Write a protein that binds this ligand. Structure first.
Ligand SMILES: O=c1ccn([C@H]2C[C@H](O)[C@@H](COP(=O)(O)NP(=O)(O)OP(=O)(O)O)O2)c(=O)[nH]1
Ligand SMILES: O=c1ccn([C@H]2C[C@H](O)[C@@H](COP(=O)(O)NP(=O)(O)OP(=O)(O)O)O2)c(=O)[nH]1
Ligand SMILES: [Mg+2]
Ligand SMILES: [Mg+2]
Ligand SMILES: [Mg+2]
Ligand SMILES: [Mg+2]
Lengths: 223, 223
C-alpha cells in the first residue's frame, strides 16, 4: 500500500468505528444517546493521559523508567481523535492527500527512532504544544498534524508502527462498544490484566481485524 | 480572620508544604532530588483530573451523576498549584492583597451555589479556558485567578469551603511526603479506601492540622 492508501484506510476504519460508537451523523456534534462530542477535548484529555506515562510529577515516584509500549498506544489513541476531528471538519482520499502533504509526514515514514529517558522533557514540551493548540479555538489542522507527527517521531513511531497499532486499538474500541462500554457494564480488567495490555499481547503476533476481535472475545469470556 | 488573612495563611501553608516536598529554593525550578518543577503543567494536569469527575466522555459510562465532594477536592488541588505559581512568580501579605483585588474574588466570598448536572458543560468550558491559558506562555496571573474563582463558584465553593478543604488536603500532602511518596513506597489505598476519601471522612469533624495528621497516621498504620 502507498502511504496515502494507509491513511485512507485509517480514515475508513475511524469512520466505521465512530458510526458504531456514536451513530450516523455524529459529525453534527451529538451521539445518538445525546452526548455532546468535543474532539478538541478528546485530544487534550488523551494528551494528559500520554503525559502520565512519564515521570513528570516532581513529588511522586520520581524514579520510574518509561514504558514506551504504553506510550505507543497513547499516541495511537490521540491519532483516533485527530482522525475524528479531520472527518468532522470534513472523500477519504482527499483528506488523506492533505495529511500526506504536511511536510513532517515524509519524515514520519522513515525508519523509527529509539527514544530514551533523556527525551522526556522535549516530549512533554511537544505534548504541551498540542494541549495548548486544541484547548483553544480556530487553530490550523495542518499545524496540529505537523506537531503531532513531530511528537510521534520523538516517541519512536513511524507510519508502519502507527498503522499496525492503530488497527489493533480500533478493534478493541469496537469490542468495548459491543460489550457495554456506554452503559458502564463493561469490565476493563480481565483477571488482573487491563484490556489494553491483553491487546498489546495479541499485537505481538501479526493478526487481522477479525482474528484480533476473536482473541479479545475469548479472553473477555474469562473475566 | 479577614479574607486577606485567610489568603495569607494559605500562602504560608503552601510555602511550608513546598519547602518540605521540594526543599528550600524550589522557586528556582528544581527539587532537591533534581526534578524539574513546572507549576503550569501541575495546573493543566490537575484540570484534566477535575474534568474526569464529569461525564464528559461521549462513549463511556454516559450516565453517571457527579460527585461534588470529589470536585471540591480537585478545585483545592488546583488551588495548591496556583498558590505555588504565585509564590514562584514572587511577602505573603503583598500577594494576598493582590489576590483579594481580583474583581470576582468578592463574589467568591459570598454564600455558595449548589450546582447540578445542568451545569457540567459550562464548568467544562471554564476548565478548558484554564487548561488553554496555563499550557501557553506569558499569561496574566490576574486573569488566571479570575477564571479560577469563576470556576470555583460554578462548582459550589466559596472562600470558607476552599479554606477548610485546603487545610485538610495540605495535611494529606505533608503526610504523603513523610511516608514515601517520592520513592514510590507509599500506599495510596488503605483497606480499599483511597487516602483522599479517608481525608474527606476526617474533614466531616472540624479538626486542626495536627489532629488531622494524627487521624491519617492511625488509618495508614492499618494498611
Ligand atoms: O467516538 C469515539 C470515542 C472513542 N474513541 C476511541 C479512541 C481511543 O483509542 C479510545 C480511548 O478510550 P478510553 O478513553 O475510554 N480508554 P483508554 O483505552 O484510553 O484506556 P484507559 O481506561 O486505560 O484510560 O476511544 C473513538 O475512536 N471514537
Ligand atoms: O510541590 C508540590 C507538589 C504537589 N503538591 C500537592 C498539591 C495537590 O493537592 C497534590 C496532588 O497530588 P497528586 O497529583 O500526587 N495526587 P491526588 O491527591 O491529586 O490524587 P490521585 O492519586 O487521586 O490522582 O500535590 C503541592 O502542593 N506541592
Ligand atoms: Mg483515554
Ligand atoms: Mg489511552
Ligand atoms: Mg493530581
Ligand atoms: Mg487530585
Amino acid at each position: 500500500m502507498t502511504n496515502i492508501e494507509i491513511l485512507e484506510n485509517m480514515l475508513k476504519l475511524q469512520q466505521k468505528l465512530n458510526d458504531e460508537t456514536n451513530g450516523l451523523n455524529w459529525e453534527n456534534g451529538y451521539t445518538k444517546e445525546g452526548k455532546l462530542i468535543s474532539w478538541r477535548r478528546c485530544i487534550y484529555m488523551e494528551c494528559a493521559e500520554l503525559i502520565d506515562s512519564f515521570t513528570w510529577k516532581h513529588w511522586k515516584n520520581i524514579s520510574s523508567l518509561t514504558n514506551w509500549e504504553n506510550v505507543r498506544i497513547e499516541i495511537v489513541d490521540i491519532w483516533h481523535f485527530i482522525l475524528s476531528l479531520l472527518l468532522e471538519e470534513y472523500d477519504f482520499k482527499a483528506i488523506a492527500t492533505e495529511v500526506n502533504a504536511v511536510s513532517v509526514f515524509q519524515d514520519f515514514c522513515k525508519e523509527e527512532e529509539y527514544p530514551n529517558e533523556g527525551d522526556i522533557y522535549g516530549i512533554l514540551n511537544d505534548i504541551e504544544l498540542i494541549i495548548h493548540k486544541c484547548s483553544g479555538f480556530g487553530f490550523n489542522l495542518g499545524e496540529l498534524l505537523s506537531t503531532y507527527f513531530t511528537l510521534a517521531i520523538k516517541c519512536g513511531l513511524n507510519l508502519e508502527i502507527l498503522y499496525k497499532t492503530y488497527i489493533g486499538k480500533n478493534v478493541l474500541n469496537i469490542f468495548r462498544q459491543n460489550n457495554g462500554y456506554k452503559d458502564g457494564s463493561y469490565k476493563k480488567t480481565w483477571n488482573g490484566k487491563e484490556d489494553n495490555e491483553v491487546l498489546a499481547q495479541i499485537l505481538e503476533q501479526e493478526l487481522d481485524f477479525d482474528t484480533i476481535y476473536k482473541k479479545l472475545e475469548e479472553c473477555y469470556k474469562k473475566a
